[PDB]
Amino acid sequence: EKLFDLVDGFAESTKRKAAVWPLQIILLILCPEIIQDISKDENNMNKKLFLDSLRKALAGHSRQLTESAAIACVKLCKASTYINWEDNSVIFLLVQSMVVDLKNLLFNPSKPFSADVDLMIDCLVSCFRISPHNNQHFKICLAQNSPSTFHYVLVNSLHRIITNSALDWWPKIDAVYCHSVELRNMFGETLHKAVQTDLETRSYKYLLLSMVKLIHADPKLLLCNPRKQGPETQGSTAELITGLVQLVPQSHMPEIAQEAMEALLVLHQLDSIDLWNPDAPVETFWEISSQMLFYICKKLTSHQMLSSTEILKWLREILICRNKFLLKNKQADRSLLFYGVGTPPICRQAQTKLEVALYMFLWNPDTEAVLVAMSCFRHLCEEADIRCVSVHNLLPNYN
């Protein structure tokens, strides 16, 4: 109360009041009983006046005052998230009294935003935390007419929901799969336009990096693909993996290439593998892995990999995980057997591309690729051993 009085001492003009408002709201929240009483004293007159100012500016009836009030009310929502969900204490009610205005301000497509990304994400995360069922703003964000900034903000919201968040009354990553189909509809709608004016391209590239980091955070967000049975598979988990693979050769944007490569490694974990095909995960796994191995090998033999070192490193990791999953399957079910061990089997052709590209690497005029192309030999011997008795019946030169 004393700090509030001192701050209200500095209510000089629109600028001073706007600056104070962010602290004034916080100080008001620091006093619960006072906030309760203001709704119903002369000692409480200035605080009731301040709330008015805020709401007034918020109602859009100057621009600076409105922006400061919106920022303060976003802070209100964030604090109310830290406020007890079970014990609302009309703090949630006080927030909801202005939440409508905030939503009609930030989440209005026609109305311009204010910077916008940070506040928008904060508001969306807070709204989800308090109200997970009331996903109206999110549903608005899944709209073609909605701006790419809307999409970027929504991606950031989902990510930070999946990213660091106190295990409080805060909801979890669940209650967001209702829009998973549309979620993968959007990265398809992007269709990687850069490879597929400048402001739009830059926005698309940043949005692409954001979705990639999202997939880093959670695979399950997009992997809900029950559509994949036949040709729909090429528009499914397979399409996802394929589109992601096509980023690695891309020299236009290297950071997204590293992110996409790491994301492929992440989704390649057996846990993530099981989340691909409910019917026969082993077969779809092996086929899609062969597809991507094909593409990578053709690109490597094409010899336009200016970052061939990192690519080969990642490919070693992919092979390691492929063999680990093969071991898991074989120990689970010994017989994989008829899908590459007996057009020829896709796995055989993929392994041929593998060995061809591995013999290519020992010829690379670099120096660090040597051990890269030798560890991969070791793992190719390991996978043949796991699949099996003479090991030379598969790779005669195993020695």
mmCIF file of C-alpha atoms in Angstrom:
data_model
loop_
_atom_site.group_PDB
_atom_site.id
_atom_site.type_symbol
_atom_site.label_atom_id
_atom_site.label_comp_id
_atom_site.label_asym_id
_atom_site.label_seq_id
_atom_site.Cartn_x
_atom_site.Cartn_y
_atom_site.Cartn_z
ATOM 1 C CA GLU A 1 0.000 0.000 0.000
ATOM 2 C CA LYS A 2 2.830 2.409 0.823
ATOM 3 C CA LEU A 3 4.581 1.631 -2.463
ATOM 4 C CA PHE A 4 1.296 2.182 -4.302
ATOM 5 C CA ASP A 5 0.857 5.555 -2.612
ATOM 6 C CA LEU A 6 4.425 6.526 -3.499
ATOM 7 C CA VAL A 7 3.911 5.462 -7.123
ATOM 8 C CA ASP A 8 0.580 7.289 -7.362
ATOM 9 C CA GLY A 9 2.640 10.234 -6.196
ATOM 10 C CA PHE A 10 4.174 9.931 -9.661
ATOM 11 C CA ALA A 11 1.078 10.030 -11.848
ATOM 12 C CA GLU A 12 2.438 13.011 -13.768
ATOM 13 C CA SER A 13 1.045 12.415 -17.253
ATOM 14 C CA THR A 14 0.063 9.676 -19.704
ATOM 15 C CA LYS A 15 3.681 8.504 -19.915
ATOM 16 C CA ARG A 16 4.281 8.461 -16.150
ATOM 17 C CA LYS A 17 0.920 6.824 -15.457
ATOM 18 C CA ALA A 18 1.529 4.238 -18.187
ATOM 19 C CA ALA A 19 4.929 3.376 -16.709
ATOM 20 C CA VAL A 20 3.433 3.155 -13.216
ATOM 21 C CA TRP A 21 0.505 0.984 -14.358
ATOM 22 C CA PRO A 22 2.652 -2.148 -14.770
ATOM 23 C CA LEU A 23 3.936 -1.762 -11.213
ATOM 24 C CA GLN A 24 0.605 -0.467 -9.907
ATOM 25 C CA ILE A 25 -1.253 -3.588 -11.034
ATOM 26 C CA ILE A 26 1.410 -5.815 -9.467
ATOM 27 C CA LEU A 27 1.197 -3.902 -6.192
ATOM 28 C CA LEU A 28 -2.597 -4.162 -6.258
ATOM 29 C CA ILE A 29 -2.324 -7.920 -6.752
ATOM 30 C CA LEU A 30 0.064 -7.977 -3.791
ATOM 31 C CA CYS A 31 -2.949 -6.854 -1.730
ATOM 32 C CA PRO A 32 -5.737 -9.466 -1.985
ATOM 33 C CA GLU A 33 -8.201 -8.036 0.543
ATOM 34 C CA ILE A 34 -7.774 -4.558 -0.949
ATOM 35 C CA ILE A 35 -8.655 -5.903 -4.400
ATOM 36 C CA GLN A 36 -11.699 -7.609 -2.882
ATOM 37 C CA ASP A 37 -12.752 -4.369 -1.188
ATOM 38 C CA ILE A 38 -12.347 -2.142 -4.265
ATOM 39 C CA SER A 39 -15.230 -3.895 -6.032
ATOM 40 C CA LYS A 40 -17.616 -2.911 -3.225
ATOM 41 C CA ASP A 41 -13.499 3.385 0.865
ATOM 42 C CA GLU A 42 -11.926 6.832 0.572
ATOM 43 C CA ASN A 43 -8.578 5.199 1.342
ATOM 44 C CA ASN A 44 -9.312 2.928 -1.640
ATOM 45 C CA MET A 45 -10.312 5.727 -4.042
ATOM 46 C CA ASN A 46 -6.998 6.020 -5.906
ATOM 47 C CA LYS A 47 -6.805 2.264 -6.531
ATOM 48 C CA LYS A 48 -10.338 2.191 -7.939
ATOM 49 C CA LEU A 49 -9.362 5.193 -10.069
ATOM 50 C CA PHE A 50 -6.256 3.391 -11.403
ATOM 51 C CA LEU A 51 -8.204 0.247 -12.423
ATOM 52 C CA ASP A 52 -10.606 2.606 -14.277
ATOM 53 C CA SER A 53 -7.675 4.234 -16.173
ATOM 54 C CA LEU A 54 -6.357 0.755 -17.160
ATOM 55 C CA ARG A 55 -9.778 -0.582 -18.316
ATOM 56 C CA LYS A 56 -10.500 2.778 -20.055
ATOM 57 C CA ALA A 57 -7.241 2.654 -22.082
ATOM 58 C CA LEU A 58 -7.961 -1.073 -22.702
ATOM 59 C CA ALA A 59 -11.471 -0.305 -23.997
ATOM 60 C CA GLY A 60 -9.891 1.562 -26.911
ATOM 61 C CA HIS A 61 -11.660 4.781 -25.976
ATOM 62 C CA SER A 62 -4.613 6.647 -26.654
ATOM 63 C CA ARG A 63 -2.457 4.047 -28.403
ATOM 64 C CA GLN A 64 0.404 4.300 -25.894
ATOM 65 C CA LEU A 65 -1.915 4.139 -22.876
ATOM 66 C CA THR A 66 -3.760 1.184 -24.406
ATOM 67 C CA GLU A 67 -0.491 -0.640 -25.105
ATOM 68 C CA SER A 68 0.778 -0.116 -21.555
ATOM 69 C CA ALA A 69 -2.578 -1.220 -20.120
ATOM 70 C CA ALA A 70 -2.533 -4.339 -22.296
ATOM 71 C CA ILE A 71 1.005 -5.152 -21.149
ATOM 72 C CA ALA A 72 -0.034 -4.711 -17.512
ATOM 73 C CA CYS A 73 -3.134 -6.877 -17.947
ATOM 74 C CA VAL A 74 -1.017 -9.601 -19.562
ATOM 75 C CA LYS A 75 1.129 -9.458 -16.431
ATOM 76 C CA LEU A 76 -2.118 -9.753 -14.471
ATOM 77 C CA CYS A 77 -3.010 -12.920 -16.372
ATOM 78 C CA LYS A 78 0.481 -14.332 -15.826
ATOM 79 C CA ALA A 79 0.304 -13.668 -12.084
ATOM 80 C CA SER A 80 -3.228 -15.091 -11.910
ATOM 81 C CA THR A 81 -1.747 -18.236 -13.416
ATOM 82 C CA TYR A 82 0.593 -18.282 -10.417
ATOM 83 C CA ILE A 83 -2.462 -17.521 -8.295
ATOM 84 C CA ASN A 84 -4.162 -20.547 -6.756
ATOM 85 C CA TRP A 85 -6.406 -22.222 -9.321
ATOM 86 C CA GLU A 86 -8.396 -24.026 -6.621
ATOM 87 C CA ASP A 87 -8.536 -20.829 -4.545
ATOM 88 C CA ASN A 88 -9.450 -18.278 -7.193
ATOM 89 C CA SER A 89 -10.218 -15.595 -4.577
ATOM 90 C CA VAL A 90 -11.975 -13.684 -7.388
ATOM 91 C CA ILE A 91 -8.534 -13.026 -8.846
ATOM 92 C CA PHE A 92 -9.567 -15.194 -11.789
ATOM 93 C CA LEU A 93 -12.864 -13.287 -11.882
ATOM 94 C CA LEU A 94 -11.008 -9.964 -11.811
ATOM 95 C CA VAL A 95 -8.817 -11.176 -14.676
ATOM 96 C CA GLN A 96 -11.803 -12.427 -16.682
ATOM 97 C CA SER A 97 -13.409 -9.007 -16.248
ATOM 98 C CA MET A 98 -10.764 -7.687 -18.682
ATOM 99 C CA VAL A 99 -9.720 -10.882 -20.512
ATOM 100 C CA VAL A 100 -12.345 -10.250 -23.201
ATOM 101 C CA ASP A 101 -10.791 -6.885 -24.048
ATOM 102 C CA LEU A 102 -7.291 -8.375 -24.153
ATOM 103 C CA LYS A 103 -8.478 -11.138 -26.480
ATOM 104 C CA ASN A 104 -10.243 -8.618 -28.732
ATOM 105 C CA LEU A 105 -7.014 -6.614 -28.810
ATOM 106 C CA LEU A 106 -4.188 -9.111 -29.380
ATOM 107 C CA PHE A 107 -6.175 -11.908 -31.052
ATOM 108 C CA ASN A 108 -8.029 -9.643 -33.474
ATOM 109 C CA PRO A 109 -6.807 -10.397 -37.022
ATOM 110 C CA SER A 110 -8.107 -7.223 -38.651
ATOM 111 C CA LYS A 111 -6.921 -5.085 -35.749
ATOM 112 C CA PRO A 112 -3.121 -4.679 -35.857
ATOM 113 C CA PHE A 113 -0.998 -5.744 -32.912
ATOM 114 C CA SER A 114 1.435 -3.518 -31.007
ATOM 115 C CA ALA A 115 6.978 -7.177 -29.147
ATOM 116 C CA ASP A 116 3.666 -8.574 -30.363
ATOM 117 C CA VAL A 117 5.029 -12.130 -30.245
ATOM 118 C CA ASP A 118 6.069 -11.988 -26.588
ATOM 119 C CA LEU A 119 2.823 -10.550 -25.237
ATOM 120 C CA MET A 120 0.697 -12.703 -27.536
ATOM 121 C CA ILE A 121 2.448 -15.880 -26.391
ATOM 122 C CA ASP A 122 2.260 -14.831 -22.743
ATOM 123 C CA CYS A 123 -1.474 -14.190 -23.019
ATOM 124 C CA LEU A 124 -2.127 -17.435 -24.884
ATOM 125 C CA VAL A 125 -0.118 -19.498 -22.405
ATOM 126 C CA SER A 126 -1.864 -17.821 -19.468
ATOM 127 C CA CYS A 127 -5.305 -18.349 -21.011
ATOM 128 C CA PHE A 128 -4.503 -22.014 -21.593
ATOM 129 C CA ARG A 129 -3.183 -22.386 -18.052
ATOM 130 C CA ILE A 130 -6.311 -20.891 -16.475
ATOM 131 C CA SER A 131 -8.725 -22.145 -19.151
ATOM 132 C CA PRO A 132 -7.555 -25.252 -21.029
ATOM 133 C CA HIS A 133 -11.079 -26.135 -22.189
ATOM 134 C CA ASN A 134 -11.706 -22.602 -23.503
ATOM 135 C CA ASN A 135 -9.487 -22.933 -26.574
ATOM 136 C CA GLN A 136 -11.326 -20.337 -28.674
ATOM 137 C CA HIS A 137 -8.299 -18.123 -29.346
ATOM 138 C CA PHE A 138 -6.263 -21.159 -30.379
ATOM 139 C CA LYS A 139 -9.046 -22.367 -32.675
ATOM 140 C CA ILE A 140 -9.007 -18.896 -34.227
ATOM 141 C CA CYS A 141 -5.241 -19.241 -34.687
ATOM 142 C CA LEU A 142 -5.809 -22.387 -36.773
ATOM 143 C CA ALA A 143 -7.221 -20.355 -39.652
ATOM 144 C CA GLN A 144 -5.922 -19.714 -43.155
ATOM 145 C CA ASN A 145 -6.976 -16.069 -42.884
ATOM 146 C CA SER A 146 -5.055 -15.871 -39.598
ATOM 147 C CA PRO A 147 -1.622 -14.294 -40.141
ATOM 148 C CA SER A 148 1.620 -16.238 -40.162
ATOM 149 C CA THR A 149 2.421 -14.268 -37.015
ATOM 150 C CA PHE A 150 -0.674 -15.860 -35.473
ATOM 151 C CA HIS A 151 0.684 -19.280 -36.408
ATOM 152 C CA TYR A 152 4.131 -18.440 -35.041
ATOM 153 C CA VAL A 153 2.632 -17.252 -31.761
ATOM 154 C CA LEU A 154 0.536 -20.419 -31.523
ATOM 155 C CA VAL A 155 3.603 -22.594 -32.188
ATOM 156 C CA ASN A 156 5.534 -20.746 -29.508
ATOM 157 C CA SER A 157 2.579 -21.207 -27.156
ATOM 158 C CA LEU A 158 2.417 -24.961 -27.725
ATOM 159 C CA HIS A 159 6.205 -25.237 -27.443
ATOM 160 C CA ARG A 160 6.457 -23.377 -24.143
ATOM 161 C CA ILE A 161 3.552 -25.478 -22.928
ATOM 162 C CA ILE A 162 5.756 -28.458 -23.775
ATOM 163 C CA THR A 163 8.887 -26.551 -22.682
ATOM 164 C CA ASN A 164 9.728 -25.465 -19.073
ATOM 165 C CA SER A 165 6.532 -25.117 -17.036
ATOM 166 C CA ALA A 166 5.917 -25.722 -13.321
ATOM 167 C CA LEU A 167 4.028 -28.973 -12.659
ATOM 168 C CA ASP A 168 1.290 -26.947 -10.984
ATOM 169 C CA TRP A 169 -2.421 -26.693 -11.758
ATOM 170 C CA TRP A 170 -0.893 -25.735 -15.142
ATOM 171 C CA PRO A 171 -2.326 -28.162 -17.722
ATOM 172 C CA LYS A 172 -0.011 -30.544 -19.599
ATOM 173 C CA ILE A 173 0.690 -31.059 -23.309
ATOM 174 C CA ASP A 174 -2.586 -33.013 -23.494
ATOM 175 C CA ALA A 175 -5.878 -31.340 -24.490
ATOM 176 C CA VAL A 176 -4.006 -30.045 -27.555
ATOM 177 C CA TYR A 177 -4.212 -33.112 -29.830
ATOM 178 C CA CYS A 178 -7.738 -32.119 -30.875
ATOM 179 C CA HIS A 179 -5.995 -29.963 -33.499
ATOM 180 C CA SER A 180 -3.085 -32.307 -34.368
ATOM 181 C CA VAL A 181 -4.466 -33.025 -37.834
ATOM 182 C CA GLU A 182 -4.682 -29.328 -38.628
ATOM 183 C CA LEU A 183 -1.279 -28.904 -36.963
ATOM 184 C CA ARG A 184 0.352 -31.189 -39.541
ATOM 185 C CA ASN A 185 -1.961 -29.534 -42.117
ATOM 186 C CA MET A 186 -0.065 -26.285 -41.432
ATOM 187 C CA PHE A 187 3.474 -27.564 -41.899
ATOM 188 C CA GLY A 188 2.186 -29.137 -45.097
ATOM 189 C CA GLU A 189 0.582 -25.827 -46.066
ATOM 190 C CA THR A 190 3.970 -24.210 -45.583
ATOM 191 C CA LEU A 191 5.229 -26.961 -47.928
ATOM 192 C CA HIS A 192 8.655 -25.408 -47.334
ATOM 193 C CA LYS A 193 7.988 -22.497 -49.701
ATOM 194 C CA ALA A 194 11.606 -21.306 -49.578
ATOM 195 C CA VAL A 195 12.640 -24.328 -51.631
ATOM 196 C CA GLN A 196 9.042 -24.760 -52.826
ATOM 197 C CA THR A 197 8.272 -10.811 -50.824
ATOM 198 C CA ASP A 198 11.344 -10.913 -48.594
ATOM 199 C CA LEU A 199 9.312 -10.291 -45.428
ATOM 200 C CA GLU A 200 7.017 -13.220 -46.236
ATOM 201 C CA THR A 201 9.979 -15.515 -46.903
ATOM 202 C CA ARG A 202 11.752 -14.507 -43.678
ATOM 203 C CA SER A 203 8.547 -14.996 -41.698
ATOM 204 C CA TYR A 204 8.068 -18.426 -43.259
ATOM 205 C CA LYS A 205 11.659 -19.416 -42.472
ATOM 206 C CA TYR A 206 11.381 -18.359 -38.829
ATOM 207 C CA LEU A 207 8.021 -20.130 -38.584
ATOM 208 C CA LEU A 208 9.661 -23.230 -40.071
ATOM 209 C CA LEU A 209 12.418 -23.127 -37.466
ATOM 210 C CA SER A 210 9.758 -22.749 -34.781
ATOM 211 C CA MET A 211 7.808 -25.799 -35.941
ATOM 212 C CA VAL A 212 11.040 -27.790 -36.136
ATOM 213 C CA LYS A 213 11.891 -26.867 -32.554
ATOM 214 C CA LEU A 214 8.319 -27.833 -31.681
ATOM 215 C CA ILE A 215 8.886 -31.292 -33.145
ATOM 216 C CA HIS A 216 12.095 -31.369 -31.115
ATOM 217 C CA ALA A 217 10.027 -30.707 -28.000
ATOM 218 C CA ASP A 218 7.344 -33.275 -28.857
ATOM 219 C CA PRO A 219 6.985 -35.796 -31.695
ATOM 220 C CA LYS A 220 3.516 -36.894 -30.615
ATOM 221 C CA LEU A 221 2.038 -33.540 -31.644
ATOM 222 C CA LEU A 222 2.139 -34.345 -35.355
ATOM 223 C CA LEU A 223 2.471 -38.151 -35.290
ATOM 224 C CA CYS A 224 -1.281 -38.641 -34.769
ATOM 225 C CA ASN A 225 -1.706 -39.912 -38.342
ATOM 226 C CA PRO A 226 -4.404 -42.605 -38.500
ATOM 227 C CA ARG A 227 -4.941 -41.689 -42.162
ATOM 228 C CA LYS A 228 -1.931 -43.708 -43.313
ATOM 229 C CA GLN A 229 -3.100 -46.987 -44.814
ATOM 230 C CA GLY A 230 -2.235 -46.845 -48.507
ATOM 231 C CA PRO A 231 -1.647 -43.748 -50.630
ATOM 232 C CA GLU A 232 -2.628 -41.680 -47.582
ATOM 233 C CA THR A 233 0.667 -42.764 -46.007
ATOM 234 C CA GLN A 234 2.458 -40.572 -48.548
ATOM 235 C CA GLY A 235 0.350 -37.804 -47.002
ATOM 236 C CA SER A 236 1.066 -38.919 -43.441
ATOM 237 C CA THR A 237 3.866 -39.772 -40.991
ATOM 238 C CA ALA A 238 5.768 -40.771 -44.117
ATOM 239 C CA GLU A 239 5.076 -37.358 -45.675
ATOM 240 C CA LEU A 240 6.191 -35.735 -42.417
ATOM 241 C CA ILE A 241 9.477 -37.635 -42.341
ATOM 242 C CA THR A 242 10.028 -37.026 -46.059
ATOM 243 C CA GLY A 243 9.474 -33.285 -45.798
ATOM 244 C CA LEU A 244 11.758 -33.161 -42.799
ATOM 245 C CA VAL A 245 14.473 -35.081 -44.659
ATOM 246 C CA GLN A 246 14.419 -32.646 -47.581
ATOM 247 C CA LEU A 247 15.645 -29.891 -45.221
ATOM 248 C CA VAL A 248 19.023 -31.559 -44.560
ATOM 249 C CA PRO A 249 20.440 -31.125 -48.102
ATOM 250 C CA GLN A 250 19.196 -27.522 -48.127
ATOM 251 C CA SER A 251 22.174 -25.158 -48.101
ATOM 252 C CA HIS A 252 20.021 -22.009 -48.123
ATOM 253 C CA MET A 253 19.373 -22.176 -44.359
ATOM 254 C CA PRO A 254 21.946 -24.083 -42.266
ATOM 255 C CA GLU A 255 20.459 -23.578 -38.807
ATOM 256 C CA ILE A 256 17.146 -25.097 -39.872
ATOM 257 C CA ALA A 257 19.167 -27.927 -41.395
ATOM 258 C CA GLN A 258 20.858 -28.660 -38.070
ATOM 259 C CA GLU A 259 17.509 -28.399 -36.295
ATOM 260 C CA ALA A 260 15.754 -30.701 -38.778
ATOM 261 C CA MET A 261 18.610 -33.195 -38.648
ATOM 262 C CA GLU A 262 18.491 -33.286 -34.849
ATOM 263 C CA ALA A 263 14.704 -33.590 -35.042
ATOM 264 C CA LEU A 264 15.009 -36.603 -37.331
ATOM 265 C CA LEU A 265 17.416 -38.164 -34.848
ATOM 266 C CA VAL A 266 14.911 -37.458 -32.071
ATOM 267 C CA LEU A 267 11.919 -38.936 -33.886
ATOM 268 C CA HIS A 268 14.052 -41.926 -34.786
ATOM 269 C CA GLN A 269 14.127 -43.130 -31.170
ATOM 270 C CA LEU A 270 12.318 -46.428 -30.624
ATOM 271 C CA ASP A 271 9.813 -44.636 -28.400
ATOM 272 C CA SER A 272 9.084 -42.283 -31.280
ATOM 273 C CA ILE A 273 9.263 -45.208 -33.712
ATOM 274 C CA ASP A 274 6.352 -46.964 -32.000
ATOM 275 C CA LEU A 275 4.236 -43.836 -32.514
ATOM 276 C CA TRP A 276 4.209 -44.201 -36.299
ATOM 277 C CA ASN A 277 2.213 -47.202 -37.481
ATOM 278 C CA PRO A 278 -0.258 -48.860 -35.080
ATOM 279 C CA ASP A 279 -0.732 -51.892 -37.345
ATOM 280 C CA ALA A 280 2.773 -52.925 -38.402
ATOM 281 C CA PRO A 281 5.232 -50.325 -37.069
ATOM 282 C CA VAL A 282 8.238 -52.464 -38.037
ATOM 283 C CA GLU A 283 7.382 -52.533 -41.748
ATOM 284 C CA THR A 284 6.573 -48.837 -42.131
ATOM 285 C CA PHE A 285 9.627 -48.009 -40.019
ATOM 286 C CA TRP A 286 11.915 -50.071 -42.221
ATOM 287 C CA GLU A 287 10.439 -48.761 -45.479
ATOM 288 C CA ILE A 288 10.554 -45.090 -44.481
ATOM 289 C CA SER A 289 14.047 -45.451 -43.043
ATOM 290 C CA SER A 290 15.077 -46.982 -46.361
ATOM 291 C CA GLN A 291 13.462 -44.074 -48.225
ATOM 292 C CA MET A 292 15.355 -41.449 -46.251
ATOM 293 C CA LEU A 293 18.572 -43.471 -46.447
ATOM 294 C CA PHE A 294 18.133 -43.522 -50.224
ATOM 295 C CA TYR A 295 17.716 -39.776 -50.402
ATOM 296 C CA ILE A 296 20.658 -39.054 -48.102
ATOM 297 C CA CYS A 297 22.923 -41.435 -50.007
ATOM 298 C CA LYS A 298 22.018 -39.949 -53.387
ATOM 299 C CA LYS A 299 22.717 -36.483 -52.009
ATOM 300 C CA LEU A 300 26.060 -37.558 -50.514
ATOM 301 C CA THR A 301 27.254 -39.346 -53.652
ATOM 302 C CA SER A 302 26.152 -36.251 -55.566
ATOM 303 C CA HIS A 303 28.930 -34.525 -53.570
ATOM 304 C CA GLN A 304 27.240 -31.186 -52.858
ATOM 305 C CA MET A 305 27.413 -31.600 -49.060
ATOM 306 C CA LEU A 306 29.404 -28.572 -47.924
ATOM 307 C CA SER A 307 28.708 -29.748 -44.363
ATOM 308 C CA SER A 308 29.273 -33.419 -45.147
ATOM 309 C CA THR A 309 30.999 -33.934 -41.793
ATOM 310 C CA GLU A 310 27.933 -33.179 -39.666
ATOM 311 C CA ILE A 311 25.720 -35.023 -42.130
ATOM 312 C CA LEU A 312 27.862 -38.146 -41.842
ATOM 313 C CA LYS A 313 27.953 -37.842 -38.051
ATOM 314 C CA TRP A 314 24.173 -37.696 -37.914
ATOM 315 C CA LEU A 315 23.980 -40.579 -40.363
ATOM 316 C CA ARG A 316 26.157 -42.632 -38.019
ATOM 317 C CA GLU A 317 23.694 -41.810 -35.259
ATOM 318 C CA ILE A 318 20.775 -42.814 -37.483
ATOM 319 C CA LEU A 319 22.456 -46.119 -38.302
ATOM 320 C CA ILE A 320 23.212 -46.722 -34.618
ATOM 321 C CA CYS A 321 19.581 -46.185 -33.688
ATOM 322 C CA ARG A 322 18.367 -48.257 -36.642
ATOM 323 C CA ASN A 323 20.493 -51.179 -35.459
ATOM 324 C CA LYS A 324 19.390 -50.672 -31.851
ATOM 325 C CA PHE A 325 15.760 -50.904 -32.960
ATOM 326 C CA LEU A 326 16.618 -53.969 -35.038
ATOM 327 C CA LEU A 327 18.120 -55.579 -31.931
ATOM 328 C CA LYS A 328 15.030 -54.653 -29.910
ATOM 329 C CA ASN A 329 12.765 -56.191 -32.558
ATOM 330 C CA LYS A 330 14.858 -59.348 -32.952
ATOM 331 C CA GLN A 331 15.015 -59.941 -29.199
ATOM 332 C CA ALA A 332 11.278 -59.227 -29.203
ATOM 333 C CA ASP A 333 10.556 -61.272 -32.348
ATOM 334 C CA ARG A 334 13.395 -63.102 -34.098
ATOM 335 C CA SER A 335 11.679 -62.956 -37.495
ATOM 336 C CA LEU A 336 13.490 -57.523 -41.409
ATOM 337 C CA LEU A 337 13.411 -61.173 -42.470
ATOM 338 C CA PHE A 338 11.318 -60.952 -45.651
ATOM 339 C CA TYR A 339 11.564 -57.136 -45.973
ATOM 340 C CA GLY A 340 15.251 -56.919 -46.872
ATOM 341 C CA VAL A 341 16.841 -60.237 -45.909
ATOM 342 C CA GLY A 342 14.686 -62.369 -48.203
ATOM 343 C CA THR A 343 11.958 -54.667 -57.488
ATOM 344 C CA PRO A 344 14.383 -56.197 -54.972
ATOM 345 C CA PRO A 345 13.722 -55.530 -51.269
ATOM 346 C CA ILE A 346 13.944 -51.818 -50.496
ATOM 347 C CA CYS A 347 16.171 -52.555 -47.495
ATOM 348 C CA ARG A 348 18.732 -54.296 -49.707
ATOM 349 C CA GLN A 349 18.864 -51.337 -52.097
ATOM 350 C CA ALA A 350 19.170 -48.951 -49.152
ATOM 351 C CA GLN A 351 22.037 -50.951 -47.668
ATOM 352 C CA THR A 352 23.672 -50.930 -51.094
ATOM 353 C CA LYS A 353 23.420 -47.138 -51.191
ATOM 354 C CA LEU A 354 24.833 -47.156 -47.652
ATOM 355 C CA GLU A 355 27.930 -49.143 -48.554
ATOM 356 C CA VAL A 356 28.429 -47.235 -51.810
ATOM 357 C CA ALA A 357 28.362 -43.907 -49.982
ATOM 358 C CA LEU A 358 30.609 -45.311 -47.242
ATOM 359 C CA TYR A 359 33.226 -46.373 -49.786
ATOM 360 C CA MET A 360 32.862 -42.864 -51.197
ATOM 361 C CA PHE A 361 33.723 -41.247 -47.856
ATOM 362 C CA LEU A 362 37.132 -42.926 -47.451
ATOM 363 C CA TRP A 363 37.953 -41.003 -50.646
ATOM 364 C CA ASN A 364 36.798 -37.654 -49.213
ATOM 365 C CA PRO A 365 39.774 -35.242 -49.364
ATOM 366 C CA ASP A 366 38.953 -34.154 -45.803
ATOM 367 C CA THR A 367 40.473 -35.828 -42.742
ATOM 368 C CA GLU A 368 37.789 -36.233 -40.052
ATOM 369 C CA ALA A 369 35.413 -38.131 -42.359
ATOM 370 C CA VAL A 370 37.755 -41.129 -42.158
ATOM 371 C CA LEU A 371 36.671 -42.255 -38.699
ATOM 372 C CA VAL A 372 33.113 -41.291 -39.656
ATOM 373 C CA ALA A 373 33.187 -43.799 -42.518
ATOM 374 C CA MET A 374 34.807 -46.441 -40.292
ATOM 375 C CA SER A 375 32.489 -46.299 -37.297
ATOM 376 C CA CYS A 376 29.735 -46.715 -39.887
ATOM 377 C CA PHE A 377 31.499 -49.829 -41.184
ATOM 378 C CA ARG A 378 31.577 -51.127 -37.613
ATOM 379 C CA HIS A 379 27.848 -50.517 -37.236
ATOM 380 C CA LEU A 380 27.079 -52.105 -40.607
ATOM 381 C CA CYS A 381 28.924 -55.197 -39.372
ATOM 382 C CA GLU A 382 27.020 -54.982 -36.086
ATOM 383 C CA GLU A 383 23.609 -54.880 -37.789
ATOM 384 C CA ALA A 384 24.487 -57.881 -39.945
ATOM 385 C CA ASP A 385 25.563 -59.703 -36.785
ATOM 386 C CA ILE A 386 22.291 -58.801 -35.048
ATOM 387 C CA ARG A 387 20.220 -59.923 -38.040
ATOM 388 C CA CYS A 388 21.824 -63.363 -37.643
ATOM 389 C CA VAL A 389 26.090 -69.509 -38.722
ATOM 390 C CA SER A 390 28.540 -67.607 -40.930
ATOM 391 C CA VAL A 391 28.228 -63.825 -41.018
ATOM 392 C CA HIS A 392 29.995 -63.855 -44.391
ATOM 393 C CA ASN A 393 26.781 -65.277 -45.870
ATOM 394 C CA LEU A 394 25.578 -61.652 -45.813
ATOM 395 C CA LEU A 395 28.717 -59.494 -45.998
ATOM 396 C CA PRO A 396 31.587 -61.677 -47.248
ATOM 397 C CA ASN A 397 34.306 -59.121 -46.442
ATOM 398 C CA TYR A 398 33.253 -58.694 -42.796
ATOM 399 C CA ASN A 399 36.852 -59.190 -41.660
#
